[PDB]
């Protein structure tokens, strides 16, 4: 089968291989795919990575290092396909990394170049988003680490 | 990186002298004990476990010979080329992928401390340390570029995933600051610092734990 | 958005880590017997350096910083 994932929703990709192997137990299936959702249902030993060269010439097809039978789709995407989980070509995907540097720039306290960013993130992603939770956690960690530094300075000096 | 102390030399290294014979003459396996023990079985450039590892000449004998057979220009690096693959990170990428770099402009973990040169963020990306200016900053940017610390996805994503796993632990450990006393809380901190020692990414988790 | 689980629901290995917490929280901390079995199955199927084992060990170490406050409950205890 060539491009087993063709015209399939991710939900269908989550079970196409399992259904095929259940209905045809004794068929040797030799398929090609490029979707991590299909790979999440396939053992590591069954995978052959085809990375050619500038001549299209590969010598031996290799298996990935990590097991891909119970792994999450993002992990297979980033570790087997070398694809970023977040789009690298979008400014909004670097907001939490920019914001973290800005907290750490002024030692870890929301300043102003960090409040414009925190409410840039709150307005974009939302209150209940994962990004805002990470920003709040980072704020709390910075404050607690500063209080730590004060306590350890008191103990030491 | 972590500061990895170049300890004594290995002895086999003296039997083989650069120029008289190629590095292939000596066995990398003999150089591994000193390098491996120094790095505790991890990379000297991107802290990748030595599952895929090779003796890397920081200064390529072909461009800076740097006395090829000097244990010091020998690092317990990552990746491997004999077994083939598509490695585009750390030492292998330093020799071929990066290109056009100055050997003296790269931080050497043996003598230079990456604690004041590199900062590891929660998002898994490495940035030059805060307050670096002029020359000093440029070494940090150069080494991040050539070693591809930010680069191939397999390293950035793996490091970010490793950091994100321990972040709730850091949260709860810093929530009980007032619940425990100073000595006990410092003991918890030391316990965490012991945990990251037997962990894949030594310094990213250390930066996420303490500052 | 797509109503698709991160891990496939048709595979027993996908629910192994969720079960690890549910069986860690069943004895409220402390890897017991049934929990320690689940932990080497996760360590054998998934690699020694995987998101699954790294997150498994986190749940361990976090219900070891909270059982300390409940062994601190042993200090204010009765
Ligand atoms: Zn490396």
Outline:
Chain A: This is Retron Ec78 probable ATPase. Chain A: It comes from Escherichia coli. The structure is cut from a larger assembly and holds two copies of chain A and one copy of chain B (211 residues). Chain A has helices spanning 10-13, 16-23, 36-39, 73-79, 95-105, 115-125, 130-156.
Q: Structural class, from helix and strand content of chain B?
A: mainly alpha
Choose one word for the global shape of chain A.
elongated
- Bound compounds: zinc ion
State the oligomer.
part of a larger assembly
Largest sheet of chain A: none
The biggest beta sheet of chain B reads: 2 strands, antiparallel
- The tally of helices of chain B reads 7
What radius of gyration of chain A results from the CA coordinates?
23 Å
Rg over C-alpha atoms of chain B, rounded to the nearest angstrom: 19 Å
Distance between the termini of chain B: 16 Å
Alpha plus pi helix count of chain A = 7
Spell out the helices and strands of chain B N to C. Answer: HHEEHEEHHHH
User: Strand-and-helix sequence of chain A, N→C?
Assistant: HHHHHHH
Helical content class of chain B: 40-55%
**Helicity range of chain A:** 40-55%
Q: How would you characterize the overall build of this protein?
A:
Chain C: It comes from Escherichia coli. Chain C: This is Retron Ec78 probable ATPase. Chain B: Keywords: Antiviral defense, Endonuclease, Hydrolase, Nuclease. Chain B: GO terms for molecular function: endonuclease activity. Chain B: InterPro entries: HNH78-like, Retron_Ec78_HNH_endo. This is part of a larger assembly, with two copies of chain A and one copy of chain B (211 residues). Chain A is mainly alpha-helical and 157 residues long. Helix content of chain A is 46%, strand content 0%. Chain A contains seven helices and no strands. Chain A has helices spanning 10-13, 16-23, 36-39, 73-79, 95-105, 115-125, 130-156. Chain B is mainly alpha-helical and 211 residues long. Helices cover 40% and strands 7% of the residues of chain B. Chain B has helices spanning 12-15, 28-39, 90-98, 135-147, 153-175, 182-197, 202-209, and strands spanning 53-56, 75-78, 118-120, 126-128. In chain B, a hairpin with a 5-residue loop joins strand 3 and strand 4 (126-128). In chain B, helix 5 (153-175) runs parallel beside helix 7 and helix 6 runs antiparallel to helix 7 (202-209). Classes of the chains: A mainly alpha (157), B mainly alpha (211). Chains in contact: A-B, A-C, B-C. Bound molecules: zinc ion.
């Amino acid at each position: 089968i060539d491009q087993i994932e063709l015209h399939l929703h991710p939900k269908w990709q989550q079970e196409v291989i399992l259904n095929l192997r259940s209905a045809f137990p004794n068929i040797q299936f030799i398929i090609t795919t490029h979707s991590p959702i299909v790979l999440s249902t396939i053992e590591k030993r069954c995978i052959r990575e085809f990375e050619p060269n500038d001549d299209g010439d590969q010598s031996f097809l290799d298996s990935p290092d990590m097991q891909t039978k119970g792994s999450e789709n993002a992990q297979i995407l980033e570790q087997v396909m070398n694809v970023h989980s977040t789009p690298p070509g979008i400014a909004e995907s670097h907001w939490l990394g920019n914001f973290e540097l800005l907290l750490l720039d002024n030692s870890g306290e929301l300043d102003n170049h960090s409040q414009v960013l925190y409410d840039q993130i709150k307005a974009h992603f939302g209150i209940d988003s994962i990004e805002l939770k990470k920003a709040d956690s980072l704020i709390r960690i910075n404050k607690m680490k500063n209080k730590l530094n004060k306590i350890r300075a008191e103990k030491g000096k | 990186m972590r500061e990895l102390a170049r300890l004594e030399r290995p002895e086999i290294l003296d039997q083989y002298i650069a120029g008289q014979n190629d590095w292939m003459e000596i066995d990398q396996s003999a150089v591994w004990p000193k390098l491996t023990e120094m790095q505790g079985g991890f990379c000297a450039y991107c802290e990748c476990r030595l599952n895929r590892c090779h003796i890397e000449h920081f200064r390529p004998r072909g461009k800076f010979p740097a006395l090829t057979f000097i244990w010091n220009n020998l690092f317990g690096s990552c990746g491997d080329s004999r077994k083939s693959g598509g490695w585009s990170r750390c030492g292998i990428y330093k020799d071929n992928g990066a290109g056009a770099y100055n050997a003296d402009d790269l931080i050497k973990p043996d003598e230079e401390n990456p604690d004041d040169y590199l900062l590891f963020l929660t998002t898994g990306e490495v940035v030059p340390a805060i307050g670096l200016t002029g020359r000093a900053l440029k070494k940090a940017q150069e080494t991040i570029r050539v070693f591809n610390l930010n680069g191939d996805i397999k390293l950035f994503g793996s490091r970010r995933t490793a950091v994100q796993a321990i972040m709730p632990n850091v949260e709860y450990l810093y929530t009980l600051l007032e619940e425990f006393d100073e000595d006990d809380w410092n003991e918890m901190l030391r316990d965490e610092l012991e945990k990251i020692e037997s962990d894949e990414y030594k310094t990213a988790l250390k930066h996420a734990w303490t500052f």
